[PDB]
Design a protein around this ligand. Structure first.
Ligand SMILES: [Cl-]
Ligand SMILES: [Cl-]
Ligand SMILES: [Cl-]
Ligand SMILES: [Cl-]
Lengths: 243, 244, 244, 243
């Protein structure tokens, strides 16, 4: 029982790898740092039950993953852009940076998904879980480029599911905010930066950051297919900040 | 054992919830209109080992009646429904009494239930309150112009009340079913007997089939577990991809 | 004679509707609870040119009352409101009578009005029915957990009822205001007296200012013109960019 | 008053050009055919009052427009791709084609908007109206690439308006479907296709295509700024098919 998780060392990657492995999955992992063999060896040694791909092209991850087993049960498309690039404004941002936002958050997941459909269909189905953002559904003033690129991939889920669900290929979008994770809300920020707390207690009904095991629980629940009729929609993971 | 309260237990999502929570280790305390009769209460408790059939019919009294059977309520499934074909009542020609009954059953009844539940649920340190609504709580349909508004009010109640209740650990959710195999709207016999339903599902449901009772059950017990608490306060389509 | 019906004319979006509709050449027939007093009707009619102040108070009877003054209704502005601070009524501690009054004024009253209007508006070859709701009809607010649901029901009424009434030429719309300069929620007095309001608007309203009466009027008369019919059946935020 | 209308020969272009001209604007027009001088001359003589730009690059249209007047009052970002590219599926579609969908429908309007902010702000404000699609908000099975690109630009309007509205630069998105226009619903289609008239009868509450003058009325109403507080949102133009 196999899962592919992209950008494994960032965003929702750590929560997904830990939860899927604890659930009995062999978790095949992609990451930019894995072009270095030393990084692959360290990740695998330090993460029992994982395989660290060398492959870096989005349209080649799936075939690479199939080197390690006969079928993929779950793909976690864990796409991200580092801070502070997610807060790039419109004015003054370079064309290169505009393109890079869409490349990482919109084009990469599409090329991945495209490459997955035929093997996933042939194996009788699978789950594809796209990790997006709260701004995939609800805008924020300081994410005017990031937001559009995230909204594209949420729309991708909603449209693609209309055809892929009949093949047993079940697509979902998760939109986090105030989620304890190394990319946007690392534990070091929570404990050292008094500004984060104060706004969580004001803006987040739950009153705290979402925990890694709570993101893991959502991912393994979707991955179980036990509630497949919720296929094809966006889930806020924001502690009640959305809607 | 965890205590759950399920309203209208014989209808809509009731049977799926009562079965899933019972198999998940809960004592399921159940409300139903038919339980005004002591005999139906006995037969229900007989056919569903573990459950308790409440006599109380008023929404504001269900929580206290449930608390006669345990120390704290872990989960409330507010499984509101109105007898068919009232969900399809049009605007023209419908009596004032029917309009009011639509809002009474689908909007006022759950508000009075939730109102009565806040204080005891806060004192016990939280709970899950899951409202069974409808796909038309989020996306309108031509033939539900009164039922839709009433469902949308209760989805909005979830979205708004969760802004304050989540801090108490009282976690609210709405489920919006369609094409869900259930005794009210899509009984198994309709799937078995009517070729038009199969055709319509093939056309309109990406998943290609009705949602199963145990799939609704799995969503409800996943929510009741609180393991993914940060998804609190939103609406979940349960439609096989028909929504959005 | 080009006739508009505006409800609760003294409140909320009423004054803006009356003024812009009158400017645009409509005979504006107005309902308002104060008009049960004959002194108020005469006064309103002399402060407001060419307007007609209805004595009628029942929602189902406003259309027939209006059709005593002309042959057909071109536009209905269903300007439903409740007095502050009922919009901020919490769930806890609120009386059942108050809960019911919120739905009565904001959900039942527009339905009864709409139901009564379909047959005569259809006979006449169409019309516009514009519901003034609120931003919480689409986006929840922590302190509007009852007002919100009642408003969301009426937005859903527009969305669903439009699926059938649009073929009759009866075009339904919902406007959802916030930070709108009006005597009910954001009076020009409140702006000048509460620096915390001006600070909240600077922080949360992209426009940076309250919406003006003539801007609400411009939206109302544009919809009433039917010049852009294909936008029928949806919700329009009137919030200065606060929504979405 | 000066308006810029892009892709003026397609989609909502002819409706925009006619309505704004009739409302007293000099309408400066972009179009890919205007690289041909003979096409510019034909267009200008056939559309009195308009100016056909030779410029083709999205980030240069604003400066090209301001050679013809002191300030831009309205920009109509009339983005489109030739049909049936709107119906491209995920499987089989080339990477170049995936990229062109986003280029025309997402990147082009961003590069245009970016270039416009400073001159529009210096002139005291303006209106920027993005013509998107109904799939910018609600998914369709046959638009799994077009949908995401449209959804990005809808999200661009919603997010960028949070900051540009303060400058008096008012952004809107219009999302048409079943709109009588030369690209997706030409009148010849209505006459030729009984399936279309049947689908419109079943799915469109208005029971008819939206007229060009009705799109024009919406554009000129928005361009007037008379109802500025509705800034920053998506308007369905679908005869009630949405929501
Ligand atoms: Cl996050
Ligand atoms: Cl159902
Ligand atoms: Cl207001
Ligand atoms: Cl169109």
């Amino acid at each position: 029982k196999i899962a592919l998780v992209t950008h494994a060392r960032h965003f929702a990657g750590p929560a997904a790898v830990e939860a899927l492995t604890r659930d009995g999955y062999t978790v095949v992992c992609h990451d930019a740092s894995f072009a270095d063999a030393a990084e692959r060896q360290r990740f695998e040694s330090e993460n029992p039950g994982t395989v660290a791909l060398a492959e870096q092209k989005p349209e080649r991850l799936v075939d690479a993953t199939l080197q390690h087993g006969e079928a993929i049960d779950t793909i976690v498309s864990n796409d991200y852009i580092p801070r502070p690039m997610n807060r790039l404004p419109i004015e003054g941002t370079s064309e290169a940076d505009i393109r890079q936002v869409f490349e990482a958050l919109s084009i990469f997941p599409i090329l991945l998904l495209q490459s997955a459909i035929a093997p996933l269909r042939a194996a009788g189905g699978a789950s594809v879980i796209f990790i997006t953002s709260s701004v995939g559904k609800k805008p924020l003033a300081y994410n005017p480029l990031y937001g559009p690129a995230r909204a594209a991939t949420v729309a991708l889920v909603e449209s693609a599911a209309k055809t892929l669900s009949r093949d047993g290929i079940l697509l979902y979008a998760i939109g986090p905010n105030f989620f304890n994770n190394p990319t946007y809300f690392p534990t070091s920020d929570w404990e050292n930066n008094p500004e984060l707390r104060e706004r969580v207690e004001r803006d987040v009904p739950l009153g705290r950051l979402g925990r890694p095991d709570e993101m893991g629980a959502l991912i393994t629940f979707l991955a179980s297919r036990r509630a497949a009729p919720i296929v094809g929609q966006f889930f806020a993971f924001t502690g009640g900040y959305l809607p």
